[PDB]
RNA sequence: UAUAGUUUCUUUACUUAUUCAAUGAAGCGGAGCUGGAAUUCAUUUUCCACGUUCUAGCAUUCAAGGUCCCAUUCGGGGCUGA
RNA sequence: GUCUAAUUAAAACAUAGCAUUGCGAUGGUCAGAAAGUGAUGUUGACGCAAUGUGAUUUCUGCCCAGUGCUCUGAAUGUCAAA
């Protein structure tokens, strides 16, 4: 299994490797569209945890929202 | 008035003329004259600059 | 292998295949009807004694119309109907509500012989 | 208490400015590579008026180098330019008047128009009837460049930034009375509606801070801070000093 | 001849109405585009951690083409012959009621990222492939780590479409060998010998080491030249 | 007073985050030719320019020319010109 | 010249003129719940904004203690959260 070690990985946060990533990710959702649509996730782990299936029907939307 | 500009003809509207329903004949005396003198005008820059960087 | 080449720094969307329809099924499956025929843009003449004064001298038919009919489907109507040629049509809009028809024809044909042959006068 | 004018003239229905028979925004040429590289010549044309502006305007006209084309522009005119008059625009320019030398070009106690403080705004400061930059010196080695401002300031820009050379057209407009509230009505219809000025110490105290009491007159003083709110500031705001000006400004 | 002349243009500052010229450096492209450079160059300026970096040293193509040959002989079957076999396993369970062992037994490439997880912590595997293309490098950051626990090799490859070539699949991002035949088992220990070398024995090190802090060309060049001018002897 | 470590703070520096402005996102940066200045202590260090200024004209047709292919034919393409 | 339409047309308001104040645009004044939002601003100190006085002539005196506005920061001063 895999999703085991990304459920973990992804809890390490604070880790140098996912604080980059997350600053790399971020840039390129802010530069995208406030509502934008993915066709694949980012944590498959957790769309799985929660009730993702992949198969046709399911579908990912990205989503920011102001802050405070 | 001009869609009466469109149904009179080319004789009306026209000059004989080179730039003709559009600048006076004295400007275009004018700017003949301005043409022919500047481009010669180039010629004598053109062949000053010349014999002046063979020489150098 | 080396890139294209651009002469306008302006990226414009691509031209693109355009399919068409031919689908699969049909929207509506009965073509309707002709919403607008001649025994429906001519509902019946007028006979008021104006109008038979125009009939008699001025050569003209008089005629009460659909709102949503116009002068060449009037035209058109009259040439089927009546078997005539016409000139000219003028249209307004009775205040009733109801559209009327002042409809010229040829001096070839006679409003007079055309609306005795009709039936009413 | 109400809102007061100076208040109401954010939102700004009435107060936009009436900007009908101007001529189009007086800017200058866009800064491509021509200008920053070498120099290019345009035709002043004709010389016009433009509302509420006291400062004629010069439709010049350019040639595109990229197109068989004819960009017009407007340019602020200075005094001495006429029609037919050829404008070089660019770095290796020549200095006469018209031109649009950059300042790293241009030497000391020089007197340029129309100039930028950051390259490619195309037209700041120095744009009013009769006024002047002056060069001061220059800091080539992180290339800025000193210039006095009419305020009678200092400022440092970058050399590579424009401007035109000699001053503004339309001086002494100010040197001339009016005489008449017809003659400034006329100004104002053109420029906006700022006019006539009501005091507030005739107004009543929901309409204006200074308003209200059995005579004109303010209570309070008309000196106020800038941490100050909009309807408290109606006077002389964060002023340093107050009165008749008793010699040197010192600055 | 004596008609033709030559005019030349002078295509300098204030004359001769520019030509077309190839500005593909001068675009205004569009954000999807933006998006994906600025993305690739942020993720080199940035001071990628080793565990990523670790990635970008990949197999060269000569023993790439290798293993891909290897494998090709161990592809996996498509659904015609699937069928096929099926049917043949049909008749012969009908008629000589072989036990479902009619068939052979068959030899093939193993995919599916977790199959190959469990597959290298039970230790069945033999070789692993991965891909660096990924997109969650989540996926498979570890695979590294965990093969080198295990003492399995691996080897990071370019193309997880090429995997999904080799394996019927669009992709696959992952690939492995558990089972060989002895026909080629012998290259398979010179191919992992190779790689081992290459990947597996240098853990430690690319472990240490931190990638990017990459410059542009702008950049570099005045880099080079400030340096050059404060290092003047 | 010198230290191998952790530490706080001051200053400075870098660009990709973020921020600002412009444009139809047109000429960025590096290097290289040319000429000039350039003194060279071998052999070149470098630095400057790298097509436009008497004149209210004109400047456009993948550029004319040069060169190489095709298939001559009506022509057609490439490289250079840049 | 204007205003209290329907009891106050005036010495009131405005006015030109005088003076002061803020602002060099990453800005000053103002608006919006917010915003990749706006008015001044198609603007740029002979300008914008805010105040006061009220043609011209002649003069605008003393007071910075108090209340405001402001300019100064080395300080056994005070002084929040972190």
Known sequence: ?68 | RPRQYATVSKTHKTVSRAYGGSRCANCVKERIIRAFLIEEQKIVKKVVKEQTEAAK | KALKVRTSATFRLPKTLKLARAPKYASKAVPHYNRLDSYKVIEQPITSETAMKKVEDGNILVFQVSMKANKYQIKKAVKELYEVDVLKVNTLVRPNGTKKAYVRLTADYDALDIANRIGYI | GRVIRNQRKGAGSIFTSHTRLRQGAAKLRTLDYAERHGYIRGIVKQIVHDSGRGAPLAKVVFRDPYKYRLREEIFIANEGVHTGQFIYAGKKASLNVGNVLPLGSVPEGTIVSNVEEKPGDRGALARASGNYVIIIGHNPDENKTRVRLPSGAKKVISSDARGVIGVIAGGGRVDKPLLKAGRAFHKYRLKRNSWPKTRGVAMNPVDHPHGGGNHQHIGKASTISRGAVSGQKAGLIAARRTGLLRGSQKT | NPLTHSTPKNFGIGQAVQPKRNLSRYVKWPEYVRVQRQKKILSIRLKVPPTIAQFQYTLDRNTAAETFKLFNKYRPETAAEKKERLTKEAAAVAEGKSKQDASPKPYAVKYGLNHVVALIENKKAKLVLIANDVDPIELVVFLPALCKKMGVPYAIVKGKARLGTLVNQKTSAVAALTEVRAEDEAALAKLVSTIDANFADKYDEVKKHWGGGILGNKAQAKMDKRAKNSDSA
């Open chain 1, 1 to 68: 299994g895999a999703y085991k070690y990304l459920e973990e990985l992804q809890r390490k946060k604070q880790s140098d490797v996912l604080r980059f990533l997350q600053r790399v990710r971020v840039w390129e959702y802010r530069q995208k569209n406030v509502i934008h649509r993915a066709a694949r996730p980012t944590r498959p782990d957790k769309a799985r945890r929660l009730g993702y299936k992949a198969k046709q029907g399911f579908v990912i939307y990205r989503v920011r929202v102001r802050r405070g």
